């Protein structure tokens, strides 16, 4: 099969700037049968370019496509706010029909450090037999942030899950929620609960901690 | 209008059989091929195969051959995707798309132009369960709600019955090892407005007909 490699994985640019997305096939695409689709979070893909160079019906002029046999490019001459999304390339000249792995075109802004907040387990939760400790990283850029949990200064592993919001419409920042789950027994077995956050905006790793029971 | 309309969200247990549908409107459905695309949670697009409904000529990806069945009822402009035994790995979004080709049988192709809205398929051992809503008490100040252990997705989360929208962050859910989902809805408000303003999260989970209006006080 024809594998399609999209580069870069993430393309960070400003609105009004030009976007240039690569699609390379592991072998020549028959009849230059390469399509480009846009996918916005929640939505279904939307055909932009067909046959490497032909602009789909209803597609604006800023979207164009070039590419011979093995190398193909999607150009967005001027990014509009609605142009920030994921872009998949696809070949349909030889079976199986394949897709590239997508290029996320996100809004580049200046570096913004996260404001970190730690939430101890509620009393009502503790009654159930499980304790959840929530660390929130608010309004930060770029998306890249490392959240480590330390329970009595011991580096945790495999007991936390992480979640990120989609780039904000207004300030172009991200927010993250991290949940460290523990049994009611192990929560009551320790005192210090600290979430350690590492980001480009932070000159030094920030630590937001509390002592179990202590306000 | 040229449309492709798919069936509603499906929640099944492993081993169960499933037939999801896709209906075409506003065009001759037996004159085009229709493609099936799988998109796994947080992943890219995967071509499953195509059906020409005019004669039920099917073509699978080697990755889907023997895993799923693609079919069509040409009388009702409808194409289907069927699993005789669903796996947990079948959990994903499924799209149907119209393959543009010439009506003259010359073998010209023009990509997939019309897509369905998608059908969410969830395969898990878990049975329907309502969320347990917990406050993330404030200590500017941040506060919120932890919406823990529910199945299936989704839960809806509002604040103050829709009054509080500014700075409200409702995070994507996380699938726990227990098979039950968890998410956080947070809201950053000014430290001075805490004592006088009421902070209530409105959690709704249609699957278990669970409605929760939890107060977040310090």
Cα angle value A196/A197/A202 (rounded, 5°):
130
Do A52 and A123 have their domain in common? no
Q: Residue A194 is part of which domain span?
A: 110-212
- A175, B169 in Cβ contact below 8 A? yes
Residues in chain A: 215
Domain at A160, CATH number: 2.60.40.10
- Put simply, the chain A residues between 171 and 190 with a CB less than 8 A from any chain B CB are 175, 177, 179, 181
Radius of gyration of chain B (CA): 22
Whether the CB of A24 is below 8 Å from some CB of chain B: the reply is no
Do A16 and A94 have their domain in common? yes
Last residue of a domain, one of A54, A84, A109: A109
Radius of gyration of chain A (CA): 23
Q: Which residue of B has its CA nearest to A116?
A: B142
Whether the CB of A134 is below 8 Å from some CB of chain B: the reply is yes
Instruction: Give the closest of B100, B148, B169 to A175, CB-based.
Output: B169
Round to whole Å and give the CA distance between B3 and B38. 19
Please choose, from the candidates B35, B50, B54, B51, the residue with its C-alpha nearest in 3D space to the C-alpha of residue B116: B35
For strand B10-12 and strand B119-123, is the pairing parallel, antiparallel, or unpaired? parallel
Would the CB atoms of B146 and A46 count as touching at under 8 Å? Answer: no
Last residue of a domain, one of A77, A93, A109: A109
Whether the CB of A101 is below 8 Å from some CB of chain B: the reply is yes
Do A127 and A200 have their domain in common? yes
Determine the distance in angstroms separating the CA of A167 from the nearest CA of chain B, rounded to an integer: 11
Round to whole Å and give the CA distance between A10 and A18. 14
Chain A neighbors of B62, CB-CB under 8 A: 1, 96
Do A126 and A98 have their domain in common? no
Do A189 and A99 have their domain in common? no
Residue in B27, B64, B111, B190 to test binding to A, most A beta-carbons within 10 Å: B111
B177 exposure class (CB count in 10 Å sphere: 0-12, 13-18, 19+): exposed
- Residues 6+ positions from B26 with CB-CB distance below 8 Å: B1, B2, B3
Chain A neighbors of B110, CB-CB under 8 A: 50-51, 54
Q: Within chain B, what is the greatest distance between any pair of CA atoms?
A: 73
- B69, containing H or E segment: strand B69-73
Round to whole Å and give the CA distance between A4 and A26. 7
Q: Which two tokens stand for residue B64?
A: 């889907």
Residue A116 φ/ψ, nearest 5 degrees: -90, 135
- A8, A63 in Cβ contact below 8 A? no
Chain B neighbors of A46, CB-CB under 8 A: 115
Quoted resolution (Å):
2.4
Do A3 and A78 have their domain in common? yes
Q: Which two tokens stand for residue B216?
A: 């977040």
Would the CB atoms of B174 and A102 count as touching at under 8 Å? Answer: no
Round to whole Å and give the CA distance between B198 and B215. 8
Chain A neighbors of B37, CB-CB under 8 A: 45
Q: Which residues in chain B are followed by a discontinuity, with C-to-N distance exceeding 2.5 angstroms?
A: 139
Please choose, from the candidates A200, A173, A176, the residue with its C-alpha nearest in 3D space to the C-alpha of residue A108: A173
State the CB neighbour count (10 A cutoff) for residue A15. Answer: 14
Round to whole Å and give the CA distance between A132 and A186. 11
Do A38 and A136 have their domain in common? no
Residue-by-residue DSSP string for B4-41:
EEEPPPEEE-TT--EEEEEEEESS-TTSSEEEEEEE-T
State the CB neighbour count (10 A cutoff) for residue B3. Answer: 14
- Catalogue all structural domains in chain B, each as residue range(s) with its CATH number: 1-125 (2.60.40.10), 126-218 (2.60.40.10)
Q: How far is CA B136 from CA A133, B29, B187, in A?
A: 9, 52, 10
Last residue of a domain, one of A109, A125, A145: A109
Is B129 in a helix, a strand, or coil?
strand
Round to whole Å and give the CA distance between A2 and A96. 8
Do A129 and A115 have their domain in common? yes
Do A101 and A34 have their domain in common? yes
Please choose, from the candidates A32, A38, A62, A68, the residue with its C-alpha nearest in 3D space to the C-alpha of residue A50: A32
Round to whole Å and give the CA distance between A210 and B4. 53
Determine the distance in angstroms separating the CA of A99 from the nearest CA of chain B, rounded to an integer: 6
Chain A neighbors of B183, CB-CB under 8 A: 163, 177
Residues in chain B: 218
Would the CB atoms of A57 and B188 count as touching at under 8 Å? Answer: no
Round to whole Å and give the CA distance between A85 and A39. 6
For strand B200-205 and strand B210-215, is the pairing parallel, antiparallel, or unpaired? antiparallel
Do A206 and A104 have their domain in common? no
Round to whole Å and give the CA distance between B72 and B51. 7
Q: Provide the domain count of chain A.
A: 2
Q: How far is CA A15 from CA A43, A67, A108, B67, in A?
A: 21, 25, 9, 43
Residue-by-residue DSSP string for A109-175:
---BPPEEEEEPPPHHHHTTTEEEEEEEEEEEBSS--EEEEEETTEE--SSEEEEE----TTT--EE
Do A44 and A105 have their domain in common? yes
Do A144 and A194 have their domain in common? yes
- A150, A194 in Cβ contact below 8 A? yes
Round to whole Å and give the CA distance between B218 and B214. 13
Q: Which residue has the tokens 């172009």?
A: A172
- B41, B49 in Cβ contact below 8 A? no
Whether the CB of A100 is below 8 Å from some CB of chain B: the reply is yes
């Amino acid at each position: 099969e024809i594998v399609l490699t999209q580069s870069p994985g993430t393309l960070s640019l400003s609105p009004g700037e030009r976007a240039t997305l690569s699609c390379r096939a592991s072998q020549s695409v028959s009849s230059s049968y390469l399509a480009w689709y846009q996918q916005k979070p929640g939505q279904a893909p939307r055909l932009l370019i067909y046959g490497a160079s032909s602009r789909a019906t209803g597609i604006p002029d800023r979207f164009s496509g070039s590419g011979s046999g093995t190398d193909f490019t999607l150009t967005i001459s001027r990014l509009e706010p609605e142009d920030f999304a994921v872009y998949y390339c696809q070949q349909y000249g030889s079976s199986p029909w394949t897709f590239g792995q997508g290029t996320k075109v996100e809004i580049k802004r200046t570096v913004a450090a996260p404001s970190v907040f730690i939430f101890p387990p509620s009393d009502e939760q503790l009654k159930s037999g499980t304790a959840s400790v929530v660390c929130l990283l608010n309004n930060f850029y770029p998306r890249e942030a490392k959240v480590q949990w330390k329970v009595d200064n011991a580096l945790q592993s495999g007991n936390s899950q992480e979640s990120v919001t989609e780039q904000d419409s207004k300030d172009s920042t991200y927010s993250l929620s991290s949940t460290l789950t523990l049994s009611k027994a192990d929560y009551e077995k320790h005192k210090v609960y600290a979430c350690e956050v590492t980001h480009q905006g932070l000159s030094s790793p920030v630590t937001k901690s509390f002592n179990r029971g202590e306000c | 209008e040229v449309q492709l309309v798919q069936s509603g969200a499906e929640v099944k247990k492993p081993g169960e059989s499933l037939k999801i549908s896709c209906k075409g409107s506003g065009y001759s459905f037996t004159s085009y091929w229709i493609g099936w695309v799988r998109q796994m949670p947080g992943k890219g697009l995967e071509w499953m195969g195509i059906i020409y409904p005019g004669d039920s000529d099917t073509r699978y990806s080697p990755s889907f051959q023997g895993q799923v069945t693609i079919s069509a009822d040409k009388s009702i402009s409808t194409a289907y995707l069927q699993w005789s035994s669903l796996k947990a790995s079948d959990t994903a979004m499924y799209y149907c798309a119209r393959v543009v080709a010439d009506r003259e049988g010359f073998g010209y192709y023009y990509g997939m132009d019309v897509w369905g809205q998608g059908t969410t398929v969830t395969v898990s051992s878990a049975s329907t369960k309502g969320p347990s809503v917990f406050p993330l008490a404030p200590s500017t100040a941040a506060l919120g709600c932890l919406v823990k252990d529910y199945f299936p997705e989704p839960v809806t989360v509002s604040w103050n019955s829709g009054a509080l929208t500014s700075g409200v962050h409702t995070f994507p859910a996380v699938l726990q090892s227990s098979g039950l989902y968890s998410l956080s809805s947070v809201v950053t408000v000014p430290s001075s407005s805490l004592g006088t303003q009421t902070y209530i999260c409105n959690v709704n989970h249609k699957p278990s007909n669970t409605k929760v209006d939890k107060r977040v006080e310090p």
